[PDB]
Amino acid sequence: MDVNPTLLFLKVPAQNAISTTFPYTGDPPYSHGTGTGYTMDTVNRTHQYSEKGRWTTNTETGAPQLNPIDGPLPEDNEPSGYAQTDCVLEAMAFLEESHPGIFENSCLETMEVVQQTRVDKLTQGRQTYDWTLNRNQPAATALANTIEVFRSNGLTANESGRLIDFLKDVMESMDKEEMEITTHFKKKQRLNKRSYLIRALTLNTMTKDAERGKLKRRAIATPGMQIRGFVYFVETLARSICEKLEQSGLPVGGNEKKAKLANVVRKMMTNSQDTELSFTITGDNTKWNENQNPRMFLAMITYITRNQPEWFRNVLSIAPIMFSNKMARLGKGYMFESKSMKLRTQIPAEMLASIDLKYFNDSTRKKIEKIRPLLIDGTASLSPGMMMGMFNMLSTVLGVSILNLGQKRYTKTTYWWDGLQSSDDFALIVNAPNHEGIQAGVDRFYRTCKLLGINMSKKKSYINRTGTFEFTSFFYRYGFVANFSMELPSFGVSGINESADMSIGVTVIKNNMINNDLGPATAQMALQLFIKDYRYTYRCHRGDTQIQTRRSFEIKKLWEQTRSKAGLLVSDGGPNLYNIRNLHIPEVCLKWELMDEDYQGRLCNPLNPFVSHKEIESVNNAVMMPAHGPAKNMEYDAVATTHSWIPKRNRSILNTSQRGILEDEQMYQKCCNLFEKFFPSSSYRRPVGISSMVEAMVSRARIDARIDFESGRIKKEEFAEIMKICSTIEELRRQ
Amino acid sequence: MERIKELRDLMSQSRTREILTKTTVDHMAIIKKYTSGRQEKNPALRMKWMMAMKYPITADKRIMEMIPERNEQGQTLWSKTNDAGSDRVMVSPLAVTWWNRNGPTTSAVHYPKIYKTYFEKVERLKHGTFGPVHFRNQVKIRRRVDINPGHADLSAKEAQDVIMEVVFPNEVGARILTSESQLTITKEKKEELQDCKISPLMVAYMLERELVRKTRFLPVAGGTSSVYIEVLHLTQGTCWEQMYTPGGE
Amino acid sequence: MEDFVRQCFNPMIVELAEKAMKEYGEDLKIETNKFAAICTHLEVCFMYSDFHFINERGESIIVESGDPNALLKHRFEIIEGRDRTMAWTVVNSICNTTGAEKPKFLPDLYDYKENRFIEIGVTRREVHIYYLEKANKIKSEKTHIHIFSFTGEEMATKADYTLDEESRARIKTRLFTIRQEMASRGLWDSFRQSERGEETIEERFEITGTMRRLADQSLPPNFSSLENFRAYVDGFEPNGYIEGKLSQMSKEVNARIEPFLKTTPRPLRLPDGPPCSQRSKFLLMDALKLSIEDPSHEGEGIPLYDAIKCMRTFFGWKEPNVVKPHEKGINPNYLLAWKQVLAELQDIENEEKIPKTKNMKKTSQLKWALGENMAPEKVDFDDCKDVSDLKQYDSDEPELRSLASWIQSEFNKACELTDSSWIELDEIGEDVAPIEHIASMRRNYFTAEVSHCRATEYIMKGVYINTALLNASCAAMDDFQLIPMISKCRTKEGRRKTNLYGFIIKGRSHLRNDTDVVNFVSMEFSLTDPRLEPHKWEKYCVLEIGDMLLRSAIGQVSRPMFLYVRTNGTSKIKMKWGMEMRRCLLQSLQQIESMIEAESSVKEKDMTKEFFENKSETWPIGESPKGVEEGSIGKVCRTLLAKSVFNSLYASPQLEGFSAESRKLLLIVQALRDNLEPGTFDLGGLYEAIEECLINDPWVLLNASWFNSFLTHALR
Amino acid sequence: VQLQESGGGLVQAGDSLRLSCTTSYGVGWFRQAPGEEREFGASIYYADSVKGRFTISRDNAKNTVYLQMNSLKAEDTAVYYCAARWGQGTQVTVS
RNA sequence: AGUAGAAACAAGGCC
RNA sequence: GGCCUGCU
């Protein structure tokens, strides 16, 4: 007899055992080298899906741009980006009519937010492409570098501390004859108008790793800092709009998505009488981002912001204006090998414009030949369409408009449709009195989608009777069925620290028990395995064992020293008291009454040199990138113990010409620590104002010395010493 | 005394003097987050990879003057080589366990008073009474429920001023809290935590967690109470219901 | 008017007033009289505060110039002259230290004698109105208020004047100096009434310059300016434009539904080529175990001593010789490496105490076997351009290979029971709730079912091997290291036992990226002759190292005993994911527990015990030439565990792609079997998407064969 | 799947023979000599010892697989079994 | 050689 | 041969 697990589906329905079809117990695919090939392929594919448009050359950037809008209507089922302006404007108008007051309200709240938003909001972001160094750097670092360059060039309106003022300075920089940047190898280099325009309109391309569910790798993009404020405002407007649309599912979580899917299916099927047939289409959109033209987003926003202050319209329109002229950096480059001479070489992507094509294979040779005409200063113009879901929410708005355009008031026919859209994925429930009606409805829906630059993937889509469908790895079969294979990768040690890892593991087990219908015995097994892996990872074994490690000696002496050994934490080699009933309690508090007072005091000592807290945002928040989803943050319950240390940093900056960044880091951190000691609320509430550091610090020294004498340790001798030391630092700052 | 003294020492050197002079208060946050350290994409892989090194964690410089450089057999506990972009020094994990067996001891009696939420959870569970398990299909319907069982009927911003006035009374600014509920909360949490020396930031964070109301969407069947939702994993399942009554009731 | 503040007042005050001007964001060129008025207010604040000191008594000491001493206390300490944030900082600090009441508006000074605030304001109008005006602005105030006015008069409540009168003569002399100096200037046409409390501003975000031209190039094809396009949008109204283009659009743009029937789906085609080879990092079906029967636990013990003790338990060693060559390497190197390992093992046996971890010598043998100094040296392009052989890295579709029957048998025997327990679980909090007791009983049942399973043994082998390899790579980056493959089990009798499959030599492991490869050489004992399925051992070199005698009724077999030696490699990501193989247990048993719960939701009672003991119900878990064979729930547990283990062992992008694109077709087939009239828009496209994932991986090809068999058995 | 073979018997060397297997999928023809286990003949690919001589074919409408043997040798002498992915086999004796 | 698979590893750089 | 780094 030959064993075959798949035959199990002959008795258990597919959805009731779908977890077996998710090989999420092995290493996910990773990219190894350059992503330049993928970037070039994506650029060429985006440009050839809109080949029948019209070509122009921008007078500012001098780059060739392709406009397919209002182009010839498609005559085949292949992907097409020839969106029609009038059709999309009409779709938005119908969306407004079905939801009166949506645009005006959303614009009002967006106007409030834009005029009260601060610059620091831009620091709350992941890697961004700093143009000062032409590389990806943390959002805060890139923002600081750009602000420094602007201030050195004379653009100091951002000193007002307002994001709108920062954007005003950004736009004013566009009209400058010559800017100056700094490079280390420090050298001051001058950038002319066109070079700075291209550096501000460019995107950095990388390869996406840890992407499960496809054989081929893809490319993703990261924009600069000049354009992120406009993107933030536009996405704020789009989120405020989608929050008023029940057909959208992008700005919500997973459980809300499931609830809305259940509600829509029940509404569609229940209202349908015996005569009407119902069919569900589990649709995926092929080349979703490559076929969405930024000009059409400009049209949608300018229709949304009608009868609004002109400044609001301008600030919200700046973003799509820059995306329509966006450029993409090709990537890291290409690495060549010569086996005859036994050597390797790494050529940067910027040489692709001039480098001969003898080194490249046929596929890459043709890709380079096709993309060369669009190469301007080492970057390729990508006007026709978006690169990687930067305007997720606006795309969801367009999809929701398409979904609502079939409310049976615009169809003007017996058939009708509804459903749920989340960018690149949708479920469409279509009802009609007969199979011919369903066919006509789906055909018209597809045709209308093709008029908006949205394509339906026929290969990854199928239609059945309502009651069974899929949506973003959520399988609905007369009710959503748990999978538990999507969350399997999150059952190990997170990698934050000991206490954080313990709390995160127990909380993940608890949550997957609540949401993903994890069984009790399975949860106990998960707890046991997690504890085993945790002890084997942090070298913290039970203590009563003879497992020799680098940490087994101190742990054993602590074990033999303690009297009530049941109170020792698993991190210190103690027994595990966790169970299904204790999954919502931190380890420290669960073992508090069992700890010896000496060990308890040594553990939770504020003066410990290991605990370090930076800001209110990073107290008990851990960023865990979930499998098959975007990066997410979790609140984990933990007590600040000596085990809450933060791990070592990379330390490879020491071998790079960018070595002075570490000295600047140290000096900035010293100044920030001094300010915090002067202003204790610096972390919890970020200080605001327009004065400089030393003014506030010296003046508060004055006052605090005064009052702490009026009652406290200070003495006249010390108070006068502080006053004249303040005068000394004053005259020092003078010179 | 000291604080202004390292201030003067910083202003002595030209670079830090320039940083202090030209940098305005508003930019405080930016430069504080200014770092070359990228946020890790795969934390688990490197935590499993770094812990195999010697000196994998980081600690303040003060550790060099509280913990000896080596233990009884000579296993090193800390190194004097500083981190990449900080004055902290890289140290071995043993320096943690050492601190828990011969490090300085204090009076942790006030931690229960600080971490009110967690200890209240423990007390509620310790006095709970279980019941028979009933096996029948559960119609889990998804609903918006409040998870925090100690929220004082305050929002984030609404309680943020209360938290500042409780911890940072001088940086409150214009705001003087009007609602009398906030008055009593301030009085109680002021007299209760009058000399607690854990940290201002952690105290503020835990006060925010305790007082601020927070809500999330979850699949529930029955219950719906704040105390009954924290144990939602233990009382409700796919085909079984476990009757439970927390210690509070 | 600004010429006056150019002339008279000192710098300090003028820049203080200029920063106060910047504070609230209004411009000085439009209205300057406010600047002069508030700078005079600030000047009176200074001149009233300075020159006034106190000592330990009350009765302020007044000195025209502060002498060098600790006695420089200031009688009145200023509030204004600071930012709003700091003004409120001082207010709150004074309130919290003085125990006084917090005012709602900005004071100007604080004093000790009377322990309270002073709000100085000198207005153009006479005092006896401005005083009570600001008084009714401030609610129930105990802070004393004092104001002057140009005529020279003073006033205050309580008839209180807080310091010397010569200072006030100073104030009013300053005051009339101001007055009869404007007399020379001539400003009272507006000086009395120049500020009325104007607060208004309009936010301006103007598109101009280059950024405007960009806006003119981001419009539809037939538009010339953003102004015109916005006007058109504002004037646009729906007039049935979607219908017109829908009618005009070609009818070939359709989404016709192709019915999906029993005869529609065709079997997935498998690639053809040379048979598929073995990819695992260790032997799974052909492993052999040398044991000692020690009482130590899994992690307890020292590796090298245990390995040597286990190997000494076997007698019959012969001089090794080549049996099956690598066919691409230098087998004599493998032979010499094996003999070197034996020699150095003896060398450890001789000395005092077995080292916890041993380093081996870097001979040419393992230099070749571990691929040392073979990475091409990195150079610059400007120095290597004329080399004809210089080209890209080989980037093409992997070699095509057809499925072989060995993977099927390997999976078959990976789901079989064993004579040992390969899982020793940790401790949990004592169960207190009845649901916890039910969970514990279920868990005990599953552990009894799966512990005696080859899948669990493979899990432990992989976890231990990858953990040791990762730790050695991170610790001994430079020097080659010896690691014996160790796994500890427990017999039926209950006696604990150790097992030594072989050895692993780890090489240089300077791993920077998650994809960087660490090469090692693995040696494993076995009894399976490699002359029967050679195509499965394409990358192995197999020697003959001894003879084994296992008790059998046919005299005694005296079988040969071979050594499978190969060069393999891994990476940080692969090591990390292989050291988390225990979650296969989770996956499998979660699936089984979901089955049990779903069935128990029907009958209102827990159904675990009868499922595991009666074994009445069975699921299709394989096909025999007679037909489909069904097994008890325990066999399903073992089968799913083996499937998860093989997923973790043979993981690859092909597996992910095939899994997704075959789950799609499985859902379609399930819809067909449920009588839900399934339909497809392009089924050929889906088939081509599935078939492109099957290239050379044995596991994915076996999964595809299983899928074809399931289709054949289904659709009936 | 039940299978019955037909068409075996005693034949001359250099003679011909058409085996047929009726069934109740890919099919195979395998043979078993008196002194041995199973030998692959053909599938629907032919073995080295029978290539060019022998031809395998099927009628999916008749539910039958055929094996046309020609130019037979004394070394073809075996029970020829039909298999689906086993028949009882049909005796062929060449002499 | 080996790992791996649309491009890489099989140490890097600095003296 | 000596020293530096391992997400920069």
Author numbering:
A (entry chain B): 1 to 185, 207 to 756
B (entry chain C): 1 to 249
C (entry chain A): 1 to 716
D (entry chain F): 2 to 25, 32 to 51, 58 to 98, 112 to 121
Quoted passage from the original study:
The influenza virus RNA-dependent RNA polymerase is a heterotrimeric multifunctional machine composed of polymerase basic 1 (PB1), polymerase basic 2 (PB2) and polymerase acidic (PA) subunits, that catalyzes both primer-independent replication (vRNA to complementary RNA (cRNA) and cRNA to vRNA synthesis) and primer-dependent transcription (vRNA to mRNA synthesis) in the nucleus of infected cells. PB1 houses the polymerase active site, whereas PB2 and PA contain, respectively, cap-binding and endonuclease domains required for transcription initiation by cap-snatching. High-resolution structures of the complete viral polymerase from a number of human, avian and bat influenza A viruses, as well as influenza B, C, and D viruses have been determined.
Using cryo-EM we determined the structure of 17 polymerase-nanobody complexes at resolutions between 4.5 and 6.7 Å; this is sufficient resolution to accurately position each nanobody bound to the polymerase heterotrimer. Nb8191 binds to the PB1 N-terminus and PA residues 405–420, 531–534, 551–557, and 624–626 (site 4c). Nb8196 somewhat overlaps with Nb8191, binding to PA residues 262–268, 624–626 and 705–712. In addition to the core of the polymerase which was resolved in all structures, the PA endonuclease was resolved in the majority of structures (excluding Nb8189, Nb8190, Nb8192, Nb8196, Nb8202), while the C-terminal domains of PB2 remained unresolved in all structures.
